[PDB]
Design a protein around this ligand. Structure first.
Ligand SMILES: *Cc1cc2c(cc1C)nc1c(=O)[nH]c(=O)nc-1n2C[C@H](O)[C@H](O)[C@H](O)COP(=O)(O)OP(=O)(O)OC[C@H]1O[C@@H](n2cnc3c(N)ncnc32)[C@H](O)[C@@H]1O
Length: 550
């Protein structure tokens, strides 16, 4: 209980800094090894509310307010050809809950976090690459580090690899699993251009489909836009052959709505490229190591999840190391929790992504980009799927409908309030479906409490919580339940009462304000199935934020 660990951290990007700040607040002894000198240039500029929340709870609010980062209200999508625009609002009602995020210059943002780490007495070595990581001694971790021109050797109780896509551990272990099809390749530059919108659109992140993929437009200053192409890795050869500059301009010129908003603006930087393929890992952590951020997995940046998942996993890996340090018998359970949680985030962002790419594929040409990414299924499943012609994948269908602008084209006429009717209409539809449920069935014959972990948001400790499950381990981990609320569900499994009874029984035990969320989550978890008065199944899903929002 008074025991704390010595922890080496490879990499001082967002995963590294957040991991070190969190481990320090949890009372551990942190060293961060970063191979570069800061500031150093880095792409990946558009952030999420969930990450601001984390930084706020770690005490960075004043330093961040000081920076005057461009504020981001939402993300806007021009998705498919001749489609109305849609926007994903960051609108949301605790002190750390954020309704917006920001856009940053990563060289400055990353250096701000790292300098904060320094100021708290965390040891930081810049220009000190970690050259080898040895885990074969089960009692310790030993790193080899290049200090000056000398190899120096250092031991620690734990190691976090936050070294980004080039982190040494996943490579060393050979546990990286590249996605078979999501092999994105990016080519980008900067323009001098002032946000052309004054209304609710100002500061929004634009993602815009064309023949060979999509274009991003991020305002990182008053008059500065990051403008990137995401294309298939099959375009590597063209860039190799014809040069990135020529590839960049002739490709970007193919995206009319993008040239539309650009309009003669001046290109104000060189163009860079990189391979950004999706991949996860067989192992997110085991024994004395954790992988965090791109070192663990990489998600197609369409929804700007990257820095958020680096931050979230960094906080989780910190809490995990703390828990194991104070309760060493829980080692296996804690690693199983870290692996499950990261895997589930990765896999469900991927499933969701597949939906979005498929929707654009109906109006974009049959290029290798769209063909690799759109859902694979029978000629007949696909023609049926132009059920789309007339509006995870209903989850995405939902988001798009709610966010649909009420005119055919993108304009400063847009206000987020014009989205309120479709929102409300979705809520009324959800309310209508739940109310029609006169009979519920439980999956299995037993309702049980199962052990689960949760990071406490204020102090960051990993706490134990009992969640609802069946005998066969299926669970709904998002809410803490007791023997008392479990009884509710055992009675349900036996008597199969409907929605009205379930709401009442929940209210009766203090859970009146969560009850709608509780039953929706149980439905999505496949633990509850609902039936209407005519005996037909009733399908409910109430998701529709992508992670790090709302
Ligand atoms: C590729 C890409 C990614 C991207 C993006 C657009 C593109 C083309 N747009 C994004 C966006 O709009 N919003 C967002 O949140 N993310 C976006 N991304 C992805 C995102 O940039 C990454 O997920 C994020 O950078 C990951 O953070 P993480 O902390 O995991 O990794 P990092 O930023 O690469 O930092 C790693 C540091 O480690 C150092 N390093 C590497 N190896 C060593 C060794 N061996 N020893 C010591 N240090 C090491 C690197 O120097 C780096 O600083």
């Amino acid at each position: 209980h008074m025991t704390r660990s010595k922890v080496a951290i490879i990499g001082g990007g967002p995963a590294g800094s957040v991991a070190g700040l969190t481990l320090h607040k949890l009372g551990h002894d942190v060293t961060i090894y970063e191979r570069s000198a800061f500031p150093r240039y880095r792409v990946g500029e558009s952030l999420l509310p969930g990450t601001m929340s984390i930084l706020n709870r770690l005490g960075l609010q004043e330093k961040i307010d000081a920076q005057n980062y461009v504020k981001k209200p939402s993300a806007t999508f021009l998705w498919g050809q001749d489609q109305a625009p849609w926007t994903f609002s960051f609108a949301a009602p605790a002190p750390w809950v954020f309704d917006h995020a920001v856009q940053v210059k990563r060289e400055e943002f990353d250096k701000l976090l790292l300098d904060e780490a320094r100021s708290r007495g965390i040891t930081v070595h810049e220009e000190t690459p970690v050259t080898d990581v040895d885990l074969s001694d089960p009692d310790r971790v030993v790193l080899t580090v290049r200090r000056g021109g000398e190899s120096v050797t250092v031991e620690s109780d734990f190691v976090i690899d936050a070294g980004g896509s080039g982190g040494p551990i996943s490579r060393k272990l050979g546990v990286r699993q590249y996605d078979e099809f999501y092999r994105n390749f990016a080519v980008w530059s900067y323009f001098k251009l002032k946000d052309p919108f004054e209304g609710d659109l100002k500061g929004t992140t634009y993602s815009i489909t064309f023949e060979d993929g999509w274009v991003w437009m991020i305002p990182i200053k008053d008059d500065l836009y990051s403008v990137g192409l995401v294309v298939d890795r099959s375009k590597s050869a063209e860039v190799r052959e014809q040069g990135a500059d020529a590839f960049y301009s002739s490709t970007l010129a193919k995206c009319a709505k993008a040239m539309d908003i650009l309009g003669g603006a001046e290109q104000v930087d060189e163009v860079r490229i990189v391979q950004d393929w999706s991949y996860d890992t067989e192992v997110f952590s085991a024994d004395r190591f954790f992988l965090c951020g791109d070192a663990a997995c990489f998600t197609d940046p369409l929804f700007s999840q990257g820095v958020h998942l680096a931050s979230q996993s960094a906080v989780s890996a910190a809490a995990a190391i703390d828990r194991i340090t104070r309760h060493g018998d829980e080692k296996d359970a804690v690693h199983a929790w870290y692996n499950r949680t990261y895997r589930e985030a990765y896999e469900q962002y991927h499933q969701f992504l597949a939906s979005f790419y498929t929707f654009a594929s109906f109006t974009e040409p049959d290029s290798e980009f769209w063909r690799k990414r759109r859902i694979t299924e029978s000629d007949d499943d696909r023609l049926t799927r132009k059920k789309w012609f007339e509006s995870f994948r209903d989850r995405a269908s939902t988001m798009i409908a709610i966010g649909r602008h009420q005119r055919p084209e993108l304009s400063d006429d847009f206000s987020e309030a014009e989205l309120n009717p479709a929102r409300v209409r979705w809520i009324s539809d959800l309310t209508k479906r739940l109310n029609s449920i006169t009979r519920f069935k439980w999956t299995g014959g037993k309702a049980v409490l199962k052990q689960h972990y949760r990071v406490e948001p204020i102090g960051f400790r990993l706490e134990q919580r009992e969640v609802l499950a069946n005998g066969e381990g299926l669970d709904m981990a998002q809410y803490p339940m007791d023997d008392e609320a479990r009884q509710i569900f055992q009675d349900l499994a036996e008597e199969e009462f409907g929605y009205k009874t379930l709401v009442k029984r929940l209210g009766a035990v203090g859970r009146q304000e969560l009850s709608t969320q509780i039953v929706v989550r149980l439905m999505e978890a496949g633990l509850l199935t609902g039936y209407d008065a005519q005996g037909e199944k009733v399908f409910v899903q109430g998701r529709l934020h992508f992670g790090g929002v709302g």
